[PDB]
């Protein structure tokens, strides 16, 4: 069970955090996680390349579709919707969507879900990390909601696997 | 090996066509394909719900990632990019992107790939089917490229599994 990751990209960060999620929330053994220039995962007979094939293999192996997807709120539709837009946007956020991210979070603890962190939160967390990390205090106060939420994800999902340093 | 599908939606059409693709291009047994109001696939021990979990299970079982994704042209990046935008757009095409679809196809046989039909072509084929099916001849001539390409996909990938009637 070895998962190999890149080290400059948010696709790897997502995968590390999902694992932290799997342990934080769900739960047997866990992947090795070595480093390389490209993303891969080999399990038993099979082999998987890229984030998405990798992601689904991971979710499949840990049975954790419902928890990451808010199946129990029928917000599955909405989770892959959010995470599909983002991976096609190449994980970049424009001010306009930063603003609307910040509105969602005024009145919700999590981006899609009511109850708990889902796959949408893990995706947006690693995407905003650097555009939030490299930031001035005066500006955040515009996105104080994204800020409050970022810290809640950081102090609750982050564990051994994630290497991103605390803000 | 039973795959159960919806019947009013393009998510099912995509899955049927992928199977037709698997036989047309790749290639052992094949799924039963019964009908219901929701998408599902059960294989051996495991069970899968929705199009994407279903899709990846299918691709995983038939080993056909490279062929659907143009791995051999390193256009994997670009394939999931195209198909992620579309599934988040809820499989609807605006005139502006219809127009740009139609430009791609003036000078390319397939949407992303040079060589062969990929996962992007299967996705856009089922999405444009009805906005193309319910159409006037005068208008198509604007999208004559999308039209030429639609017929090429229809006469080459379509097989037993797809139920959409010929245009
Ligand atoms: Co829940
Ligand atoms: Co966008
Ligand atoms: Co090829
Ligand atoms: Co769009």
């Amino acid at each position: 069970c070895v998962l190999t990751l890149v080290q400059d990209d948010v696709k790897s960060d997502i995968l590390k955090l999902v694992l932290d999620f799997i342990k934080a929330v769900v739960v047997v053994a866990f992947p090795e996680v070595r480093h390389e220039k490209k993303i891969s995962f080999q399990y038993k007979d099979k082999q998987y390349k890229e984030l998405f094939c990798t992601l689904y293999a991971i979710i499949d192996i840990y049975d954790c579709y419902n928890e990451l997807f808010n199946e129990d709120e029928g917000k599955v539709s909405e989770n892959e919707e959010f995470i599909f837009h983002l991976a096609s946007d190449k994980f970049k956020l424009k001010q306009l969507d930063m603003k609307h991210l910040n509105d969602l979070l005024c009145e919700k603890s999590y981006i899609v879900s009511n109850r708990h962190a889902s796959i949408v939160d893990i995706f947006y967390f690693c995407s905003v990390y650097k555009p939030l990390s490299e930031m001035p205090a005066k500006e955040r106060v515009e996105i104080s909601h994204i800020y409050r939420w970022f810290l809640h994800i950081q102090e609750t999902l982050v564990g051994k696997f994630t290497t991103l340093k605390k803000l």
Side-chain angles (χ1 to χ4, degrees), chain A residues 135-137 140-144:
Chain A
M135 263 210 158
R140 317 200 155 165
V141 89
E142 301 180 355
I143 60 168
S144 87

Side-chain angles (χ1 to χ4, degrees), chain A residues 70 72-73 116:
Chain A
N70 289 104
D72 62 321
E73 292 156 74
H116 52 81

Side-chain angles (χ1 to χ4, degrees), chain A residues 85-86 88-89 92-94 97:
Chain A
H85 181 96
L86 203 58
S88 64
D89 276 2
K92 306 290 174 167
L93 295 140
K94 216 286 161 181
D97 40 51

Side-chain angles (χ1 to χ4, degrees), chain A residues 24-41 43-49 51-78:
Chain A
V25 180
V26 202
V27 315
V28 63
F30 266 95
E32 287 279 304
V33 87
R34 321 205 185 293
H35 300 291
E36 267 181 29
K37 310 284 180 159
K38 278 210 182 172
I39 294 169
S40 50
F41 186 66
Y43 170 80
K44 282 196 180 176
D45 286 68
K46 315 232 167 46
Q47 186 173 355
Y48 312 110
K49 296 175 288 313
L51 163 82
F52 287 65
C53 248
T54 299
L55 189 62
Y56 283 76
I58 286 167
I59 289 174
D60 188 40
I61 282 149
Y62 294 99
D63 214 49
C64 53
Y65 181 76
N66 162 41
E67 303 76 349
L68 289 154
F69 278 94
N70 289 104
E71 188 184 354
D72 62 321
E73 292 156 74
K75 301 196 135 223
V76 175
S77 60
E78 194 180 334

Side-chain angles (χ1 to χ4, degrees), chain A residues 141-163:
Chain A
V141 89
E142 301 180 355
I143 60 168
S144 87
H145 295 314
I146 295 166
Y147 195 35
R148 167 198 52 90
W149 156 92
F150 190 94
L151 310 166
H152 180 72
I153 308 303
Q154 171 179 284
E155 292 298 304
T156 66
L157 294 189
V158 177
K160 293 179 179 179
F161 293 89
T162 297
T163 54

Side-chain angles (χ1 to χ4, degrees), chain A residues 82-130:
Chain A
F82 274 84
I83 74 158
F84 281 162
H85 181 96
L86 203 58
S88 64
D89 276 2
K90 278 128 187 319
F91 308 91
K92 306 290 174 167
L93 295 140
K94 216 286 161 181
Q95 274 327 124
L96 177 63
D97 40 51
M98 277 290 192
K99 222 167 152 304
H100 199 82
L101 194 59
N102 186 72
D103 291 332
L104 277 179
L105 303 173
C106 162
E107 63 185 342
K108 295 190 88 154
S109 310
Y110 308 99
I111 303 177
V112 159
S113 174
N114 317 284
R115 286 204 81 253
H116 52 81
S118 75
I119 188 74
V120 181
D121 308 275
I122 285 166
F123 268 56
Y124 287 79
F125 181 83
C126 320
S127 298
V128 323
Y129 183 89
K130 79 144 210 79

